[PDB]
Ligand binder design. Sequence first.
Ligand SMILES: NC(=O)c1ccc[n+]([C@@H]2O[C@H](COP(=O)([O-])OP(=O)([O-])OC[C@H]3O[C@@H](n4cnc5c(N)[nH+]cnc54)[C@H](O)[C@@H]3O)[C@@H](O)[C@H]2O)c1
Ligand SMILES: NC(=O)c1ccc[n+]([C@@H]2O[C@H](COP(=O)([O-])OP(=O)([O-])OC[C@H]3O[C@@H](n4cnc5c(N)[nH+]cnc54)[C@H](O)[C@@H]3O)[C@@H](O)[C@H]2O)c1
Ligand SMILES: [Zn+2]
Ligand SMILES: [Zn+2]
Ligand SMILES: [Zn+2]
Ligand SMILES: [Zn+2]
Lengths: 374, 374
Amino acid sequence: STAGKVIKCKAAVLWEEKKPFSIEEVEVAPPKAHEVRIKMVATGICRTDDHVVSGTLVTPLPVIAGHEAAGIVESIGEGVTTVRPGDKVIPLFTPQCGKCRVCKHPEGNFCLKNDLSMPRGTMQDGTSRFTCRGKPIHHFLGTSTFSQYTVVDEISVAKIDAASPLEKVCLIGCGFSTGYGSAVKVAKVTQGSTCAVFGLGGVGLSVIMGCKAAGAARIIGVDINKDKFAKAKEVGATECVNPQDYKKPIQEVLTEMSNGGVDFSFEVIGRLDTMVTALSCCQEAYGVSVIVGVPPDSQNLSMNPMLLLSGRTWKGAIFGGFKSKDSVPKLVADFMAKKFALDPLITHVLPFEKINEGFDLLRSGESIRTILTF
Amino acid sequence: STAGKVIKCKAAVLWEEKKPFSIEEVEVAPPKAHEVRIKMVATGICRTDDHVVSGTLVTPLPVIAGHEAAGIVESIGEGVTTVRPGDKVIPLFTPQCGKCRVCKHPEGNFCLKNDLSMPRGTMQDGTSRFTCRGKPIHHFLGTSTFSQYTVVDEISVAKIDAASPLEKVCLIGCGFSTGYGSAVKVAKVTQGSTCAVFGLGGVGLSVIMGCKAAGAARIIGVDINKDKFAKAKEVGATECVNPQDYKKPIQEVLTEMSNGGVDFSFEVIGRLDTMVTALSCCQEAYGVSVIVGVPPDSQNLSMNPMLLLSGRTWKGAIFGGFKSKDSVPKLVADFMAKKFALDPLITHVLPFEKINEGFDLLRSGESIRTILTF
Ligand SMILES: NC(=O)c1ccc[n+]([C@@H]2O[C@H](COP(=O)([O-])OP(=O)([O-])OC[C@H]3O[C@@H](n4cnc5c(N)[nH+]cnc54)[C@H](O)[C@@H]3O)[C@@H](O)[C@H]2O)c1
Ligand SMILES: NC(=O)c1ccc[n+]([C@@H]2O[C@H](COP(=O)([O-])OP(=O)([O-])OC[C@H]3O[C@@H](n4cnc5c(N)[nH+]cnc54)[C@H](O)[C@@H]3O)[C@@H](O)[C@H]2O)c1
Ligand SMILES: [Zn+2]
Ligand SMILES: [Zn+2]
Ligand SMILES: [Zn+2]
Ligand SMILES: [Zn+2]
């Protein structure tokens, strides 16, 4: 009975940077051609959502953020062929249009239809499906999952297993897949290798999971918050180091510990300095460093290109290098077959109405992932 | 006989930066254990040798430079097993000790015994075999080929085909192998791809050769000296562009030409700005950029890490990624079997006594490789 009609529902609207979200009524338009309207079931709080609040990641405001989620299709627009009403789905913050040069490339995943490189905060057609207080509200990464209902382009949604536990598999929509893929797909961690992981939040823990799945012999976790170390060891870290404990720069410490540099390093924080440190700590001739963290808007790092000339490889990726629509359903199926665990990432559960408390938990350092239930 | 005796011979000594080489008599000590004394036959002038002169590459002075060469073994020290008097050899400016973690790694070539990272200007034992006017003279990269005779460590020499033309295959000691391997081994250029090569000197031409051998469909040469374009097209460039001809930055031009960025780019100059440009012009999701040029001493570049986060790979390499002692004899065998050409790189052939004139031809833009013959 809601098909083709505007839905009034609650969402978490961000009117201004550095302010709490406002939980209030919004109007959600019905889906246009090749659009899908989704009743959200669960959404995670990723640090990237906090970057919108802090102005680390610039996107137009006011906005409905959220990009790590799962829900159930309420209705489909004309021409949709890949999902149906009642299907469980994960919104894809990295689309997979299937048609652009990146989607056609065997190793590309950062589809040209993304809204991350130069955010406009719209649907693919350049418009918004959201109104609040009579004012248009921006989308975020084509997903806008901090709402009881959202509308996404068909290229930004994947159908998943009907028996999936949505309160767990929402993490496949960002943090798990990103970290795990950064290890297994992007870095291609090898059996017996030594890895260093900078940042032990939900994404860095997922990197550790992937490095352990790939057979690394040593996985060194690096965080300035020693409270993060116990869970990092639970999921595979062999040792953890806090840069604040040492007189020398941590790249020197890690080089010493690894008898000349690590095989694979990962920056999973979002700081320019730790991007350079993570590069430096990998072995100069054959090391690989992967940037995963989101940098502060418009800022440049400084580095000595001799770090690369000796043989290092430096790369980054979005969403763990996974082609999103192909990969998300497979990841869910693998989760259902117990090929990896998600519970270690989930430290807190809250109702959606307590979103601000969920952000407080992230900012205090206490949580990994809080899962919000609608 | 000269074996076991000091040899007095002619060499080109660099007494201070930014001055001509001094062509004069030096004394060359006999080889100690695990050392090899070589009568030089031909040596190329590589831009890296000019970097010593210009202070772009810091190494202890006074020095006998030269690292791209070929000669004939005059004598061997105790314990040498890999070459014998009379053998044709190429000195290896990147050693292959066979024992270090890099040598044992399948993809590493920048052996830890190298003298490039932290140049000492000596033999492996920390001493010099050269004196001039009563003063000790430094080695360069364990090779020092601007001399009628040199002494190298065994790990810094490879035996090559006895029928090799040394006046050509000396280029396998640096510029050919570096450029060719940077394409075929480090970048792993693919069939049908689009490449951009920044800098069309001897090394950049060799990159083009490798890109063509790997089956690239398009190879765009980039140089500010349009006189370099004809030879670049002869060896495989499909297009050449001069940044000075355009109102827009050349990364934008190249991105437009390639309908969204190139598959592979190469920086083969040694400038910070062109390293960043070359990275930027590769496709943001799956492009690869390789730094080959030697940067100016102690200078850092500035870049936006979103260039990497989207999916680019940035790497550099010494000597085309080739394990030097394994690879050099095979490259020479391949040359003998007509698998690649060296003549396109050779624009001038001068007696050794004309070393300064050879450097002037490089600096003026007029040469690719000058081969000096002893
Ligand atoms: N590339 C992608 O597709 C992608 C996906 C998801 C998240 N991200 C980014 O990845 C980063 C991590 O996200 P998350 O795991 O949700 O965040 P998080 O939970 O905030 O974890 C970051 C961790 O970094 C630690 N940290 C902060 N500063 C330092 C320091 N100087 N040295 C060492 N550790 C430090 C911090 O204590 C925390 O445990 C953020 O920048 C996200 O925006 C990127
Ligand atoms: N990585 C290695 O193992 C390795 C080996 C050999 C050479 N090198 C370095 O590679 C670089 C090239 O050596 P080479 O081919 O002998 O030098 P080269 O013959 O001087 O060629 C350099 C080319 O760059 C061109 N150039 C200069 N400035 C610009 C600019 N702003 N934009 C575009 N083109 C420009 C110039 O006109 C010339 O044709 C040097 O920095 C060497 O030191 C590195
Ligand atoms: Zn696409
Ligand atoms: Zn995220
Ligand atoms: Zn070695
Ligand atoms: Zn050279």
